[PDB]
Amino acid sequence: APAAVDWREKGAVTPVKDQGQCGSCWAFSTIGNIEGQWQVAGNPLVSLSEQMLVSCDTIDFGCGGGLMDNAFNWIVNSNGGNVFTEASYPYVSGNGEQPQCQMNGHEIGAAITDHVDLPQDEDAIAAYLAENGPLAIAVDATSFMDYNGGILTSCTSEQLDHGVLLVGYNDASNPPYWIIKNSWSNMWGEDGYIRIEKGTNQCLMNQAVSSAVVG
Ligand SMILES: N#CC1(NC(=O)[C@@H]2Cc3ccc(c(Cl)c3)OC/C=C/COc3ccccc3C(=O)N2)CC1
């Protein structure tokens, strides 16, 4: 793969969001992925709606939790592949309140046809990322809690508990690192982002990597 990829610079990554007091990281990971895949497939970058998943996805458990694979499954099999725009269906569950699913009054911003699950292989991940755009990944986010900045090189890697967005990497660095977009606002980490070492399966980052398919 290329020595370095940063999908932010290429316009496939929206501003950092904030899930708030709701267990919806799974929806933010899924949407960030679809946002990146939709742009890189050749369409204008558009912000898409986590609230659609929080309120309408019947496979997952709204603010109680969920899985990116199940979110992809719901979008394709229950919503005809369609993803509503962030603007037309704003995120209101940041206080943990969960309105009922609202199917009316929105604009469709993107569409997906399937999803893939990537092998548990950092090189396989980097190539698919470099080709297709940002990727949905799960991490053990234990070491995320005290992170101010820098590259994590001894990330607690015991148990997966948090969905994030993989937007890039940089091998021409010492250590080399992945770039991750978190959903804890831009006042956490490196303006919303975190760097973790690439090649040592930091935070169990290789274990559950997925992506929507566009087109
Ligand atoms: N934010 C947030 C919260 N965490 C999640 O939504 C995680 C977010 C999450 C955690 C771990 C993950 C993934 Cl892919 C997501 O990968 C391994 C999967 C473990 C089992 O995850 C679940 C399976 C079924 C239903 C929910 C989960 C789950 O625990 N999802 C606390 C609710």
| Among candidate residues 161, 116, 118, 125, the one with its CA nearest the CA of residue 142 | 161
Does residue 29 contact residue 17 with C-beta atoms inside 8 Å? no
Looking at residue 153, its amino acid is T
Q: Which tokens sit at 171?
A: 């091998």
* Method used to determine the 3D structure: X-ray
Question: 210: which strand partners?
Answer: 117, 136
Ligand 1 centroid distance, CA of 84 (Å): 23
Residue whose entry in the numeric block shows the structure tokens 């943990």: 96
For 1-215, CATH gives 3.90.70.10
Q: Decide the pairing of beta strands 135-139 and 209-213.
A: antiparallel
Ligand 1 centroid distance, CA of 12 (Å): 25
Ligand 1 centroid distance, CA of 25 (Å): 8
Give the Cβ contact number of residue 153 at 10 Å.
12
Which of 135, 162, 164, 207 to mutate for ligand 1's pocket (most ligand atoms within 8 Å of CB)?
Answer: 162
* Protein residue whose Cα sits closest to atom 5 of ligand 1: 65
**Contacts made by residues 36-39, CB under 8 angstroms, sequence distance 24+:** 36/7, 36/12, 36/133, 36/134, 36/135, 36/165, 36/167, 37/112, 37/132, 37/133, 37/134, 37/211, 37/212, 37/213, 37/214, 38/83, 38/109, 38/110, 38/112, 38/214, 39/11, 39/12, 39/133
Whole-angstrom Cα distance, residue 202 to residue 2? Answer: 20
Q: Which residues are catalytic?
A: 25, 162, 182
Looking at residue 138, its amino acid is A
* Protein residue whose Cα sits closest to atom 1 of ligand 1: 23
Q: Which tokens sit at 115?
A: 């999803």
Does residue 149 contact residue 189 with C-beta atoms inside 8 Å? yes
For the chain, the domains span: 1-215
Q: Decide the pairing of beta strands 114-117 and 193-197.
A: unpaired
* Protein residue whose Cα sits closest to atom 24 of ligand 1: 66
Q: Work out which ligand 1 atom sits closest to the CA atom of 25.
A: 1
Around ligand 1, the residues with Cβ closer than 6 Å are 23-26, 65-68, 138, 160-163, 208
| Among candidate residues 204, 109, 195, the one with its CA nearest the CA of residue 161 | 204
